[PDB]
Design a protein around this ligand. Structure first.
Ligand SMILES: [Zn+2]
Ligand SMILES: [Zn+2]
Lengths: 254, 250
């Protein structure tokens, strides 16, 4: 039997439901399309540093970075990505952060193929950047090189999960819109519309959820929805990964 | 003081030479284009199984296999190849077989990459009862193959552990196909006509590696393994002499 934690469950256009839930229950609600985001109070004050300094992080290419590459550069970056994951996952799988999900869901690292593992998770440092802050979505199928990207299947309930460790001075958080771009090319066009026009005209019609996750909070959300992290005024630290629910069970990757 | 061994040194059209050399000296003779192959007596008759059974092999995608993949399957098969190399190379580094080269040449695994990751070091091969050549740059999917430099003195190196009863060996021709497309074209001629016309009057070397012998050769030359009547077991890798030093991969 599992720990329950204070949770706020958010759906577009609706007041947040406040409940005490297990991690597996929050993840089930998302996978059932019963929530767009859930924010949970996981780590109490004073214990936040221990999750970051966890010895399993000790010893970085992300899948989102791998997806940007094309042709021979995608072959060479895939070699870096998969070669690295194997060096670092032995440590990551022991982290309290990764164990949150392996325990709750019986999750395992996503594998390709012999089977070799995707990278499990990343610690993320956000340094002050004076920009709009950047809207993107995460979908394991969204390689820029459509032909040569080898994960061609989309999971409509793919989740992002990140635990906030240090918050920015200005309390920088996340905006999530009711908009799901259909492909990497669609996001890539949206980026060009932003840089030229300062805006994304399609968004002025979309409902948005603004989230300000605090130190110790885990934010779980449907990562296919467009979203963006606000400009930070000082250092923000988070740890995160993504989840997909496969025929063989829950799988984790970053 | 490094080990010294009996070596036979072959060169197209010239008499086989009998020398006695270190592994480093044999490799440097090939790398100076002063031999096409060298066969050396390395492992004494009582000791061959122990090389096969080295604990460093306790743990199957090769570079040659990866080369034949195209498009998304190339990216997927590359993920498998580099992922496996990460798993197994720490063991492989400790094997007597890999150490022949890392000791002789200060060789290291070939790397690719912002972060450097290793190619697979070596493989043990079991043969149970079409000529080709090996060049690191000869991926079939040329636009997507990331290794663009050809090394003219690329070597293959294999130690024979168990020989076939019919004493099946290796033939090399003085013929160096210029890309994977050239090789695939010759394959289409062998299949469609029953030989490769260009090879008829080409100089050839016939090798008959025995158990305990190391065969080092210039792998860009077309070559073929003769058909075996019984089980043949070998351990093998390739060498290229890069800007950074000698690098091993399979
Ligand atoms: Zn995201
Ligand atoms: Zn060969």
């Amino acid at each position: 039997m599992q720990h329950t934690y204070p949770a706020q469950l958010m759906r577009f256009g609706t007041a947040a439901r406040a409940e005490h839930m297990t991690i597996a229950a929050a993840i089930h609600a998302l996978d059932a399309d019963e929530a767009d985001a859930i924010v949970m109070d996981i780590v109490p004050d004073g214990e936040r540093d221990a999750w970051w300094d966890d010895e399993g992080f000790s010893s970085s290419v992300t899948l989102g970075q791998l997806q940007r590459e094309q042709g021979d550069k995608l072959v060479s970056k895939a070699a870096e990505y998969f070669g690295i994951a194997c060096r670092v996952n032995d440590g990551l799988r022991t982290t309290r952060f990764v164990r949150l999900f392996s325990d709750a869901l019986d999750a395992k690292p996503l594998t390709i193929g012999y089977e070799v593992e995707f990278l499990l998770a990343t610690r993320r440092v956000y340094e002050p950047f004076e920009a709009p802050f950047a809207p993107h979505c995460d979908d394991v199928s969204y390689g820029r090189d459509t032909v040569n990207w080898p994960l061609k299947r989309s999971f409509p309930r793919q989740l992002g999960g990140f635990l906030t460790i240090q918050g920015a001075d200005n309390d920088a958080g996340m905006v999530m819109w009711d908009n799901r771009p259909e492909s990497r090319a669609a996001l890539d066009e949206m980026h060009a519309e932003y840089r030229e026009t300062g805006a994304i005209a399609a968004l002025e019609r979309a409902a948005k959820i603004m989230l300000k996750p605090q130190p110790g909070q885990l934010t779980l959300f449907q990562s296919k929805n467009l979203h963006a992290i606000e400009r930070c005024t000082s250092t923000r630290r988070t740890m995160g990964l993504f989840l997909i629910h496969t025929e063989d069970g829950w799988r984790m990757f970053d």
